[PDB]
Amino acid sequence: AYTNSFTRGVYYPDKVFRSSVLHSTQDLFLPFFSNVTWFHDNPVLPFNDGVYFASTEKSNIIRGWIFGTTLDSKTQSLLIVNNATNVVIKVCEFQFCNDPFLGVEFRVYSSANNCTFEYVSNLREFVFKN
Amino acid sequence: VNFNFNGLTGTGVLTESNKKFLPFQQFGRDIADTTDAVRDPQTLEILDITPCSFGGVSVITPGTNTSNQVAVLYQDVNCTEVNVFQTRAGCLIGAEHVNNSYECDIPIGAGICASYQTQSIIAYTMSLGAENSVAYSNNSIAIPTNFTISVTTEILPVSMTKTSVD
Amino acid sequence: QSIIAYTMSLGAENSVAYSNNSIAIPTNFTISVTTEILPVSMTKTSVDCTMYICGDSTECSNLLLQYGSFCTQLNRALTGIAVEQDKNTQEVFAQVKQIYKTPPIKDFGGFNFSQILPDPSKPSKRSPIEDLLFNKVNGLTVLPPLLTDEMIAQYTSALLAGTITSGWTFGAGPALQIPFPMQMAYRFNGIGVTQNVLYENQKLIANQFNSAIGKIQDSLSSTPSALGKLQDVVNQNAQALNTLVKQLSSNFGAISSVLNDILSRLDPPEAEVQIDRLITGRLQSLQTYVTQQLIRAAEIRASANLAATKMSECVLGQSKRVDFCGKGYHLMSFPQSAPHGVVFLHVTYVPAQEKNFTTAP
Amino acid sequence: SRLDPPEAEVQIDRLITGRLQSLQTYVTQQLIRAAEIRASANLAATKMSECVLGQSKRVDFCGKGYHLMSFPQSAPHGVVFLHVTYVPAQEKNFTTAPAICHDGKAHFPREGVFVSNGTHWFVTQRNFYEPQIITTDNTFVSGNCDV
Amino acid sequence: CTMYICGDSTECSNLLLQYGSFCTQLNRALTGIAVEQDKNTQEVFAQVK
Ligand SMILES: *[C@@H]1O[C@H](CO)[C@@H](O)[C@H](O)[C@H]1NC(C)=O
Ligand SMILES: *[C@@H]1O[C@H](CO)[C@@H](O)[C@H](O)[C@H]1NC(C)=O
Ligand SMILES: *[C@@H]1O[C@H](CO)[C@@H](O)[C@H](O)[C@H]1NC(C)=O
Ligand SMILES: *[C@@H]1O[C@H](CO)[C@@H](O)[C@H](O)[C@H]1NC(C)=O
Ligand SMILES: *[C@@H]1O[C@H](CO)[C@@H](O)[C@H](O)[C@H]1NC(C)=O
Ligand SMILES: *[C@@H]1O[C@H](CO)[C@@H](O)[C@H](O)[C@H]1NC(C)=O
Ligand SMILES: *[C@@H]1O[C@H](CO)[C@@H](O)[C@H](O)[C@H]1NC(C)=O
Ligand SMILES: *[C@@H]1O[C@H](CO)[C@@H](O)[C@H](O)[C@H]1NC(C)=O
Ligand SMILES: *[C@@H]1O[C@H](CO)[C@@H](O)[C@H](O)[C@H]1NC(C)=O
Ligand SMILES: *[C@@H]1O[C@H](CO)[C@@H](O)[C@H](O)[C@H]1NC(C)=O
Ligand SMILES: *[C@@H]1O[C@H](CO)[C@@H](O)[C@H](O)[C@H]1NC(C)=O
Numbered sequence: 001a002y003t004n005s006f007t008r009g010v011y012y013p014d015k016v017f018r019s020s021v022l023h024s025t026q027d028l029f030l031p032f033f034s035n036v037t038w039f040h041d042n043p044v045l046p047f048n049d050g051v052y053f054a055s056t057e058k059s060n061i062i063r064g065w066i067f068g069t070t071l072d073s074k075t076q077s078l079l080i081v082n083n084a085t086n087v088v089i090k091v092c093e094f095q096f097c098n099d100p101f102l103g104v105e106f107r108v109y110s111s112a113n114n115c116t117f118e119y120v121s122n123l124r125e126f127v128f129k130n
Numbered sequence: 131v132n133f134n135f136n137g138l139t140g141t142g143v144l145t146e147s148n149k150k151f152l153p154f155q156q157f158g159r160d161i162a163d164t165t166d167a168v169r170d171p172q173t174l175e176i177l178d179i180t181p182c183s184f185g186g187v188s189v190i191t192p193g194t195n196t197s198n199q200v201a202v203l204y205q206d207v208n209c210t211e212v213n214v215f216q217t218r219a220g221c222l223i224g225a226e227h228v229n230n231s232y233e234c235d236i237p238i239g240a241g242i243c244a245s246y247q248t249q250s251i252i253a254y255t256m257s258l259g260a261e262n263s264v265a266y267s268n269n270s271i272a273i274p275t276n277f278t279i280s281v282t283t284e285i286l287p288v289s290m291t292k293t294s295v296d
Numbered sequence: 297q298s299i300i301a302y303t304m305s306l307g308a309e310n311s312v313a314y315s316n317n318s319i320a321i322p323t324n325f326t327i328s329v330t331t332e333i334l335p336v337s338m339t340k341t342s343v344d345c346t347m348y349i350c351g352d353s354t355e356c357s358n359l360l361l362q363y364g365s366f367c368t369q370l371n372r373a374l375t376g377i378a379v380e381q382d383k384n385t386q387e388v389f390a391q392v393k394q395i396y397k398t399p400p401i402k403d404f405g406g407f408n409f410s411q412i413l414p415d416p417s418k419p420s421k422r423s424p425i426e427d428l429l430f431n432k433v434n435g436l437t438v439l440p441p442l443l444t445d446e447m448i449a450q451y452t453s454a455l456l457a458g459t460i461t462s463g464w465t466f467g468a469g470p471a472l473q474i475p476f477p478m479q480m481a482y483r484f485n486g487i488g489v490t491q492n493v494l495y496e497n498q499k500l501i502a503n504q505f506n507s508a509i510g511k512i513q514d515s516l517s518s519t520p521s522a523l524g525k526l527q528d529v530v531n532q533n534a535q536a537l538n539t540l541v542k543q544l545s546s547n548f549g550a551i552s553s554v555l556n557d558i559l560s561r562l563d564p565p566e567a568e569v570q571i572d573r574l575i576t577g578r579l580q581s582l583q584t585y586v587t588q589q590l591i592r593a594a595e596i597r598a599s600a601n602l603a604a605t606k607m608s609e610c611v612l613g614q615s616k617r618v619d620f621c622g623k624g625y626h627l628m629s630f631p632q633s634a635p636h637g638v639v640f641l642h643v644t645y646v647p648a649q650e651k652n653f654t655t656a657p
Numbered sequence: 658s659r660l661d662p663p664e665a666e667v668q669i670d671r672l673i674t675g676r677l678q679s680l681q682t683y684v685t686q687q688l689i690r691a692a693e694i695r696a697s698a699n700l701a702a703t704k705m706s707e708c709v710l711g712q713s714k715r716v717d718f719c720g721k722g723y724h725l726m727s728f729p730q731s732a733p734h735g736v737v738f739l740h741v742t743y744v745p746a747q748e749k750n751f752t753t754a755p756a757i758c759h760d761g762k763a764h765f766p767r768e769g770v771f772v773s774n775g776t777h778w779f780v781t782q783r784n785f786y787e788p789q790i791i792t793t794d795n796t797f798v799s800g801n802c803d804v
Numbered sequence: 805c806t807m808y809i810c811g812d813s814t815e816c817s818n819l820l821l822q823y824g825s826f827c828t829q830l831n832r833a834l835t836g837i838a839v840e841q842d843k844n845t846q847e848v849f850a851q852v853k
Contacts, residue, residue: 015157017167164434205439219439234442259392268403272472275785279741283738284720295680492763492800546822546823594692594693609716
């Protein structure tokens with residue numbers, strides 16, 4: 001399934017305050033009325049220039065992401081788990097499950113070698129770009 | 131001061147700002163891509179950046195033919211930064227400002243004109259001419275009895291030197 | 297609804313019933329007030345060449361000395377323009393040697409004049425019409441004009457007062473009081489209409505005049521494009537200045553657009569080259585800006601000369617030049633001040649209802 | 658003299674670019690000055706045609722006052738006009754009215770105002786006080802005394 | 805401006821971007837002239853309704 005992005009997907013290009021000014025800037029943005037894929041499951045999807053993600057959940061079912069290339073412990077990968085009261089951003093050589101999931105239990109990866117990073121700190125929209 | 135706030139560098143005067151920044155905005159920029167406000171990295175105070183005062187310095191004087199006394203105008207400079215008279219055109223030093231209006235002599239801008247009077251240089255708001263109320267009414271008329279012919283001189287340029295450069 | 301394309305019409309056709317023996321004369325007439333808006337002056341922008349090109353940097357300031365008088369000539373040209381703007385303002389408005397005032401008792405026959413005369417209610421001492429005209433409109437500085445808005449307004453008040461209480465006599469010399477109805481009578485005689493026409497219809501003409509003045513106020517308020525010429529002049533100078541600042545932030549082939557970064561990153565033997573590239577680029581940009589200003593100034597001066605001629609012939613007298621002081625047979629005009637310009641309200645006689653009578657040569 | 662062609666070419670190119678830009682600026686400045694001079698010359702030519710070869714009715718075109726005549730004089734690179742104008746000097750308050758009522762007929766001045774010596778009405782030219790007796794030969798009748 | 809200076813060449817077209825608005829200002833000036841020519845024509849001939 002596909003839907004109409006309408007006028008969603010705009011973000012603040014930088015950390016600069018501007019008042020009553022029209023600012024012209026070129027960056028990676030979601031085109032207006034663009035075609036975005038509607039998923040109901042969780043297959044592996046491509047990541048191109050950057051990804052726009054959105055969800056309309058009341059039960060908070062979707063609450064994390066895996067980013068990387070191999071996702072099989074061969075290369076360092078980024079795992080995010082917005083769990084309970086503590087969202088953990090961790091970058092390691094994770095050996096991910098071939099069908100990773102969280103329980104209601106954590107079965108995302110089977111191994112986590114060469115860890116390099118750890119940090120702890122309705123309609124939800126996110127933009128992810130590297 | 132020559133300032134460096136994180137990665138924002140430059141020279142200027144910093145004052146308290148009355149702007150309200152969003153929690154994630156580090157500095158402000160105007161319509162001409164000039165930084166005009168910064169958030170203080172330590173105390174979360176917003177400061178406005180005003181470029182350091184500068185301007186032309188002009189000397190207003192009657193010619194050395196009459197007096198060697200001069201007055202100096204600092205254009206767009208406030209007098210606390212430099213007979214001291216603060217006017218809309220800048221800070222004027224050496225002229226005595228007076229209330230009596232006269233025909234404008236030497237222009238200083240903003241209606242203020244200077245003149246050499248009995249002697250010193252003075253500054254005043256220029257007069258636009260003598261007032262002359264007309265005795266208007268619906269029933270009375272005035273006609274010249276002794277007319278005068280006037281000869282005036284109007285000078286216009288017609289041509290210029292025919293310079294030819296190879 | 298949709299967008300259509302068509303061959304444009306040039307106006308309605310109107311065949312004239314020409315013959316060798318029949319004539320049509322307006323039984324009635326309408327006074328028309330039209331608004332003509334002319335620019336008089338522009339913002340007195342002054343850009344310091346050295347400070348613009350070499351932003352407080354000793355190495356650049358010294359390198360800039362190898363270009364001789366280029367900065368001196370540019371500063372001179374901009375000074376010349378700034379002076380010309382005040383010359384233009386004085387030529388347009390300062391044509392009267394005395395400040396005339398209207399009487400406390402405004403008995404001008406219901407020819408209101410409230411909309412053109414200053415009132416004591418606003419602190420600006422401007423007319424309602426002037427009120428509408430005003431309300432509806434890096435190393436560089438802007439110089440203030442010699443004549444502030446209040447001073448310019450005092451001039452229009454004086455010219456209006458003289459036109460109302462002494463007609464054209466104050467323009468040619470001493471102000472000679474005359475009842476306004478006779479001033480109108482002379483102006484009617486001046487266009488080939490005998491003065492008895494004015495006197496017989498004086499009440500009709502005065503009431504009729506008010507609706508025309510009120511309409512001028514409503515027309516200016518209603519149509520936002522009425523003052524497009526002055527806004528266009530303002531827009532041209534704003535664009536010219538915004539162009540220069542953006543050009544300053546350009547690289548012009550240099551490794552970096554920021555002079556301090558050039559000095560920090562490169563040793564003098566290389567920085568000299570990158571600075572020379574920035575100096576050449578910024579100097580060329582400043583040359584272009586000054587050239588654009590000199591041209592714009594010439595157009596403004598031509599406009600100011602037209603405005604000065606227009607006031608002398610339309611305000612201080614009565615014009616016989618067709619369509620010079622508006623459409624129709626000119627009777628009088630009233631100046632109003634505006635930001636960076638002058639607005640003329642032209643009062644003209646226009647034939648309205650012609651008839652076929654019998655005639656012979 | 659100092660640099661071999663492989664280096665002199667570069668230094669010469671820099672001098673050529675600089676001098677050409679300077680000459681371009683000089684020509685541009687001249688073209689502008691010339692346009693202003695031409696505008697001035699067009700004004701001077703119009704001024705002579707209307708002020709010298711005729712009599713002008715354009716107020717303040719040929720000097721202040723009511724133009725009578727002018728005389729051209731030559732000058733270095735220009736022309737000087739001596740403008741001879743009529744100027745009112747000593748006005749007086751006379752007695753006047755917009756019209757005269759006679760047999761119920763409204764008599765309007767053919768020219769001028771209904772001037773007088775404070776007692777007996779007269780008629781006279783607008784631009785010069787010279788009171789005349791009000792007669793049927795210097796007035797016309799239109800309408801009546803109630804209008 | 806761009807098409808004149810950089811005749812359909814990517815390298816030139818990209819290098820020309822370092823000159824900022826020069827091409828924009830030149831295109832604007834020529835547009836202004838083109839518009840003025842029609843204003844002049846209407847002012848001279850279109851004086852009758
Ligand atoms: C959520 O699960 C992760 C699994 O690694 C754990 O680190 C984190 O502490 C959990 N959240 C809380 C609030 O304990
Ligand atoms: C562990 O991670 C570092 C990343 O800083 C990488 O350079 C190193 O090669 C990794 N270990 C192995 C065996 O590749
Ligand atoms: C100019 O100089 C002459 C003599 O040097 C002098 O007589 C004249 O008064 C001077 N004018 C002024 C304004 O000082
Ligand atoms: C001069 O400085 C004082 C103190 O800040 C300020 O109040 C005043 O407005 C200044 N004058 C101008 C012209 O800025
Ligand atoms: C002008 O007069 C007012 C009071 O009449 C006075 O307050 C003011 O200081 C005077 N100005 C000068 C320059 O003396
Ligand atoms: C008019 O002026 C002349 C020259 O000043 C004088 O000789 C003459 O007496 C005056 N005549 C009148 C009537 O005022
Ligand atoms: C002339 O026009 C005015 C305004 O419309 C009107 O009041 C008057 O009656 C008209 N008179 C004639 C002669 O038609
Ligand atoms: C002037 O205009 C005002 C605006 O309300 C009106 O009230 C008044 O009657 C008019 N009077 C004259 C003399 O024009
Ligand atoms: C004027 O004359 C033409 C023909 O001679 C006639 O058609 C037209 O109606 C006339 N106009 C009036 C108002 O009589
Ligand atoms: C003209 O009339 C006014 C008042 O009506 C009077 O004050 C003035 O003195 C008069 N001028 C002469 C020369 O009589
Ligand atoms: C007005 O002028 C006439 C003619 O000069 C004269 O007879 C008369 O005495 C003067 N004054 C009066 C009383 O009208």
